[PDB]
Every structure is written in C-alpha cells, then in structure tokens.
Symmetry: C3
Subunit: 177 residues, 3 copies
C-alpha cells in the first residue's frame, strides 16, 4: 500500500540524535502551487528523537503562513502520537534547532546556514502528552527566511532545499544509587 511507503520513509532516521534532514525537491513547482493555494502545507516524514522516543514531524509553508504569508518560508515542528508515549516524560522539553542549509561545497567555501534554536514552551499544549486536549498546532517560525533571502546564496540548488531539524540530547548525571 501507501502506508508501507510511509513506513519506509519514516525509517530515515531511526532514533538518531533527533536529526532529520528533509529534502524538498521541485522547489519552483511547489512554490507556484503554494502561491496558487494559500495555507498549502508540506509535511516531512515522521522521525523519532531517540530509539523508542518522541515521534515528531516538521511542516513547512513554502509561500508562508501567518505573519509570513506570501513573503517568507515558515517552519514548524509538532509532536505526534507515538507508541511509546507512556514511557517518556511530559511535557516534551528537548531543545530543537531548525536549519535551512546552504548547498555549497564545503571544500570551496564555508556554508552559511539559516539556523534558529528554541526551547519548547511547557505551556504550548502541543508539547504535552498526546491525547490530552480533545491544536494540533506546531511550534516554530512564520518568518524563518524571506523569499528574497532564500535566493541570496546556494539555499535553492538543483531546484531543491534542505531542512535540518535537530533535537538536543538531554544529558544527565546519575542516580548511581
């Protein structure tokens, strides 16, 4: 079926340091479609923070929404219902970094990524345990990058863009006892 294809798309990546790299291809056609249909939303494959961890999903508005409608690219992340939610602490409080990657060869010039970092609001409600609020609203930036800034370097290359969503590892001390 098509859920089988979605499953295989999800397995990149398995609980890998919270790092998802989402390639949005045919950039011009998707941008035209978004300009023709306001509030057109693209969805990344669902990805887990760690093995048996939080299930997250990144979404993008190529023509922007909210304060960025028509002028910017908008980036959001949302917690999804996961099979292991009962084994994780809530609310979700792991630091997240969005990045629009500069597709430049690292050997000829240092890339300048458009990077932003945020800490989940304990009161954002969506970062609370799934199934508590029967919003459904991702958290992020409506003005992540402007339409003019996205053409200023190698952000769009071969009609494709790269969005890197990295979730921070908590790191703790023992315990021991």
């Amino acid at each position: 079926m098509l859920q089988e294809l979605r499953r295989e798309l999800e397995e990149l990546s398995v609980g890998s340091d919270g790092v998802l790299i989402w390639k949005i291809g045919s950039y011009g056609r998707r941008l035209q479609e978004a300009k023709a249909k306001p509030n057109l939303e693209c969805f990344s494959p669902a990805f887990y923070t760690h093995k048996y961890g939080y299930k997250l999903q990144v979404s993008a508005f190529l023509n922007g929404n909210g304060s960025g409608e028509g002028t910017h690219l908008s980036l959001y992340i949302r917690v999804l219902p996961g099979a292991f939610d009962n084994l994780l602490e809530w609310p979700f409080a792991r630091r997240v970094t969005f990045s629009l990657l500069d597709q430049s060869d690292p050997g000829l010039a240092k890339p300048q990524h458009v990077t932003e970092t945020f800490h989940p609001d304990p009161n954002w409600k969506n970062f609370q345990k799934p199934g508590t609020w029967r919003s459904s609203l991702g958290f992020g930036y409506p003005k992540f990058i402007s339409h003019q800034d996205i053409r200023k370097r190698n952000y769009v290359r071969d009609d494709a863009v790269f969005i890197r969503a990295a979730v921070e590892l908590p790191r703790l001390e023992h315990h021991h006892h």
Copy 2:
C-alpha cells in the same frame, strides 16, 4: 508480498541495537484468548543482537505455561537461524535481561520494572549453532495479580524489553 513486507518492515524497526521493546496491545482480548486456548504463544519481531549478528526472538505466554500455566506471564527467548551465523562464535553466550516495564511517567514517579537477568547456558541446545522450539526463560516471570499492582498494564498495552549485552 505486502503482508510479508510489513513483517520485514517491523523487523527493521528494532536493530542491531540489541535492545528490543515489544509492545503488546489490546491486552484484555489477547489474555482472554490465551485463557481460552492453553499454551497460546505470542511472538516478538525477530531482532538482531548487533549489525550482522545473532538473530533472536522473544516469545510470551500471557496465560503462562509450564509451572506458571494459568497464574503467570511466561517469557522466553530463542536463537533463530540467521544469515550471518557462519560469522559468529558459538555457543551464544551473551547476557540477556528481560523486563516488564512500569508504564509510569518518569517525571512523576520512578518506575519499578520487573527485571530478570541470565547468562546463556553453554549446554542449552538452542544456544548452540542452528542446525549443527528450544526457548529459554521464565515460566513465572510475573503473577497475574502483580501485573495489576502498578502501571504495567496501561491503556490496554504491555511492554516487554529484552536487552542483550554488548561485546
């Protein structure tokens, strides 16, 4: 093929990590099924100890078998024929830890897992090289009364953890 590909897909979800977390949902329906059919066996997805390592499988009796039939949940592990068996040392002698997990929020109370650990017996026929079942485990892993004593059954679901030691 589609059903068998679903199978292979849920096999990939595990690793290679050596840590398997097996979620058994609709606990009540399956417990009644096991009570209606003695020795009814549930099977975990096959999972590898490491990349290109031993292929293992966990099996469970929700109504118990052997000394625990009708009173306990029984947990066993068995070695399966793996594609890389000719590249591994035998007999399988890596420490194994079974856990029935307490589905409690770690931020509100520290969970109390029901854990058991064993080292593979060199003379247990199943831990020998396949072809050159015979599962090993505990018939009295947890009693029917103790499995209701905390958050072991939550939202009609149970979690069986099987952790294999690193080389």
Copy 3:
C-alpha cells in the same frame, strides 16, 4: 510493488560506519552463470558511508574481468548519485577496505580474511561529483578460483564481501 523489497534490502545495511556486508548465496550456480556469460556483474545493495552521506555500491565479477577473467574474482566499488551529494565534499576521499571473509568460528580458530585497502585517488573520475563531470575502482585479481576454495571462503554455498569506509574526525574550537 517489487521495487519496495529492493529499498528494504538497501537500508537494512546503509547507515552503519560505511560497513556493508554483502552475502552472495548459491555460489556455484552463479559462478557457472558467470562462466556462461562473460563479464556478468553482481551488484551489492546501495549503502551510505554515513547518514545523509555518500551513496556507494560494491560490484563483483565471480568469473573475473580484465586481467582476472576466468581465473579470479574481481571486486569494485562505485559512487552513485545520492540525494545529499550537494551537502558533501568532493572528490570522495575516504579510505576503503575490501575483505573476503573466512567463514570460520572466531572462537576455535582465527579466520584469515583476504583483505585489500586503498585510498581513493583525487584524480579518479568516478570519485568526482556524480552527474557533474561507469568506471568503478577496485581489484581484478582479488582472489583466484583456487584460493577461494582453500579455506572457509565459500561455506554452505555462500560468500561474504565486506566493504568498510573509514570515517574522519575533523574538529575545531572549544
């Protein structure tokens, strides 16, 4: 579709430190198939050096090609076009190690793998950026037909080809 089992074979292997273990079964049937069709090439599943890294593929001539046709097994590796090529440095310059494994129990006797190692030449054509420029790189005489039978290289009518790519470790400030 059937193309999905192919991708399930792929990512059952890729993410690891550039280490692909390719199991070629029914060795005898495929060997006489290659003997019946010169230059018959077997292909490993595509595998990535790291997550979002280079996409590589190993290929084999069971009856050999080039200087080893009819006498040896020939082993090659090739860079394939990957979705993240624009985020990687070129040319590919990660050291590669081929190994034919001696399928012997490591606890009763030490295996003797047939191992060869190379560092990719920066002026090699295939190691340049895919599309922005098929000649794989490798060994035509990796192992002879007689040497592949001398130990447990062929066991239970199966062979194991290990291709390991070395990872770097560059770093900066605090």
